[PDB]
Structure 1
Amino acid sequence: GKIQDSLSSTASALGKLQNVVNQNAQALNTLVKQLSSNFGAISSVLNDI
Structure 2
Amino acid sequence: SALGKLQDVVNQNAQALNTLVKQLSSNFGAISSVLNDILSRLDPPEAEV
Question: Taking structure 1 as the reference length, what is the TM-score of the superposition?
Answer: 0.73
Structure 2 unaligned blocks of 5 or more? 39-49
User: Counting helix residues as a fraction of each chain, which structure ranks higher?
Assistant: 2
After the TM superposition, list the runs of 4 or more consecutive aligned residues in structure 1 that deviate by more than 2 angstroms: none
Amino acid in structure 1 at the alignment position of 2:33: S
Counting aligned pairs with the same residue, the percent is: 97
**Structure ID, larger Rg:** 1
Say whether residues 1:30 and 2:22 are aligned partners: no
Question: Taking structure 2 as the reference length, what is the TM-score of the superposition?
Answer: 0.73
